[PDB]
Amino acid sequence: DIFNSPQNKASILTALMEDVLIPKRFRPAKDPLDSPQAAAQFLKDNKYRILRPRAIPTMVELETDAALPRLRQMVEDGKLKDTVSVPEGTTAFYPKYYPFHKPDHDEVGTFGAPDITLLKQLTFFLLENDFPTGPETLRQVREAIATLQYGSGSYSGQLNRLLAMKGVATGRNPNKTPKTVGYTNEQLAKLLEQTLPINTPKHEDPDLRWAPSWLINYTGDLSTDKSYLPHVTIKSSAGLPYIGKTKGDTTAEALVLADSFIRDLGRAATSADPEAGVKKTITDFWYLSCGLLFPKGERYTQVDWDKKTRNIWSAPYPTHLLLSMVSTPVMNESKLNITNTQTPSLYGFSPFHGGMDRIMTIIRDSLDNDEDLVMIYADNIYILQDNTWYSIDLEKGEANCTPQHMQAMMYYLLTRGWTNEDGSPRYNPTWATFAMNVAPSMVVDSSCLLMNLQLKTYGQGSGNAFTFLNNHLMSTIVVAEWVKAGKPNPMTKEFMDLEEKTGINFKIERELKNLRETIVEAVETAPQDGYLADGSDLPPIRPGKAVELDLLGWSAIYSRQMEMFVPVLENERLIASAAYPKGLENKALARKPGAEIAYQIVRYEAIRLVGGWNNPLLETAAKHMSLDKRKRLEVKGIDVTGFLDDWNNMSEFGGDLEGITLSEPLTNQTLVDINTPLDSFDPKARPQTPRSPKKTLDEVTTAITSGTYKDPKSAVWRLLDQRTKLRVSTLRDQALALKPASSSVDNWAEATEELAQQQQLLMKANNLLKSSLTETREALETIQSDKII
């Protein structure tokens, strides 16, 4: 007996405890900053502000019908918990927040696992198919698996991120308030009328006059039972004072705290001593300004794992609720962007249903007419000039925000949104006080919690209800300054000089040269074969050239079948998402077997839908995998159609492609359906902005340089601007000045004008002039004497 197949004999030591094609799992390094002592020393060494820790009173159980009288019937019907847990204890506690960082040095598991199954399938399919693009697709997917890692970073990554935020806010280019840049609240509002056009909330929506719990209508009758409050993610964190609880566990508690904060603020504002009362309320509710520093799940670079972890500033549920009551009713009625309105705004943009083709038409018309073009989306700016497409991103956007930026946004929302047709306010002095005087210092330049450490937040908390709005306002200032400077080319020093002028850090992320010629090429190289070409259910052998705009992560591809540009996910994103697919993170659906099962198909269909369809190797492998899974289910008689119809609520690409079904496999018709426009497009037929319709951003900028719009014409708006300059002690007098307009009394307009005349008499008193935002921060950071556990 000779010639037996050799087997690897190893030592007993080896037994007791290389493939180039498959990369080994990434094991994060040991984190030296994983202790409060080490983290605090690191921050102290790096001159990052650590606040004197404030404590929260211990929880006390109260009767729900006593705390929330509006919801007595809900308690009586056994539909709402009979007791609420509120921080009203005699003893206090210091809060601690210890987030989970996965994968970590000790645990490299299922979470953040790369799609090795897909990698193997891509390899097998490449061996059987002569796709010209195939070898590069495989190499890129393998490289993304080898260089990236999906996960929640590390304590070191989070701490280093915080340092970078301090650097943006106070380092090379220190932040500047809009006033410092040269804009009054009214001048900014005139710019925002163009860059962020808004409509008023619905006439049936409640005005900003009530305690949150009053906006809940409960009787028992399902046809009439309604909540006029913003919607919340039930499974998301409650934030302070309920660490380790979800919003679902604490809605009654959040209502109690939100009602109390707004009610107490209101009472204090009109009291005998508004300064002492307002400061006391702010100090008592300090925790409403402190976010939990949550590590964001992303496809981080392995080598930079401990250098950068993006954070989500997890806002206290009551604060989130109160802020959302101001923003959401306005924004829900304001899905106005460049594809439907004459505005640079990209708010509510979707590249699907002809959206990308509308952008391409606007780009082509601008190129043909030798016109410059600008588009704004939060911290993203797009400039078309000199036959070049530029993508400009604010450098760590949130860090550039000052409380004054948010106050200017609140001014814009309350003047252009929360207003009646007659010019009377859709708010009372209590809500004007919260919105203008307190709210901006609760989420901007406030604090965050990591472990037992209460740390300073430099700029706005990323993830707060106003993140997009505040970032959009900052980009509006950068764009307005670019227009003022005579539109300098983004590659020049004249453009880069706008960093110091605005106090806003930014960088050129993309420079797409010879745009006109690139577009011609995209049209000419469009294939005659396959999906959206001859309409067959196959990828093209050789795909066409893409116009790599990276417009909110999208590139443009020309379709011969549809005779239009269609979106495809930017290559780098497509490859990263294929390499590290997110799990069923979406909702609390994770334990649902139907959802978990359907997701496996959803994952591969979504990657095809977003642009994989146009990559022959990726399309071949992903089609095979989804079909194989569907076949297994069909044969086995396991039905997951429900989850496949409502797949949007599970896929990271779900929001983008709403109302399409994955119960049937992806075909050419799926691609046709997602790209089908409801209406034909004429850029000239797009309605103008709701406010200053005939004016352009360029005209408003020119008017501002001439000193126009320093002060609003409306007396109501003048009182709201004066509100930003007057100290908290003046709150009772400011409430009196607003009461006639707020109550819509007979001849309120004349009365408001006379009251503003009276208030103007305070405005000679330099002693009465102090930002309520500074007073809020002082009160939030104050450390009053209390006995801890």
Residue numbers in the entry: 3 to 19, 27 to 798
Q: What do the paper's sentences say?
A:
Members of the family Birnaviridae possess bi-segmented double-stranded RNA (dsRNA) genomes and form virions with non-enveloped single-shelled icosahedral capsids. From sequence analysis it was proposed that the RdRPs of Birnaviridae possess a non-canonical active site where the polymerase sequence motifs are re-ordered C-A-B, motif C containing ADN in place of the conserved GDD catalytic residues. An additional unusual feature of birnavirus RdRPs is their ability to self-guanylylate: auto-catalyzing the covalent addition of a GMP moiety to a serine residue of the polymerase in a template-independent manner to form VP1pG. We have cloned, expressed and solved the structure of the RdRP VP1 from IPNV in both its apo form and bound to a catalytic metal (magnesium).
Crystals of full-length VP1 with the C-terminal hexahistidine tag removed diffracted to 3.8 Å resolution but proved refractory to further optimization. As for ΔC55 VP1 in the large unit cell, electron density for residues 3–19 was present in the active site. Some residual electron density could be observed linking residue 19 to the first residue (E27) of an adjacent polymerase molecule, but it was not sufficiently well-resolved to allow modeling of the intervening residues. Despite being crystallized in the presence of Mn2+ and ATP, no metal ions or nucleotides were observed at the active site. While additional electron density was seen connected to the C-terminus of the molecular replacement search model in three of the four copies of VP1 present in the asymmetric unit only eight additional residues (791–798) could be placed, suggesting that residues 799–845 are not ordered. Surprisingly the C-terminus of the fourth molecule in the asymmetric unit (from residue 687 onwards) is significantly refolded compared to the other IPNV VP1 molecules and IBDV VP1. The strand that runs along the side of the palm domain is shifted ‘upward’ to lie at the outer rim of the active site cleft. Neither the helix that lay between the base of the palm and fingers (residues 706–716), the three-helix bundle (residues 724–781) nor the intervening loop region are evident; instead the polypeptide has flipped up and projects away from the back of the fingers. Models of a VP1 elongation complex based on superposition of the reovirus RdRP elongation complex or of HIV reverse transcriptase in complex with a DNA template require refolding of a small segment of the VP1 C-terminal extension, residues 654–670, in order to accommodate the nascent RNA duplex (not shown). It is possible that the purpose of the C-terminal extension is to rigidify the polymerase during initiation, but that this extension must peel away to allow the growing nucleotide chain to exit the active site. The structure of VP1 where residues 688 onwards are refolded might thus represent an intermediate unfolding step rather than a conformation of biological significance in its own right.
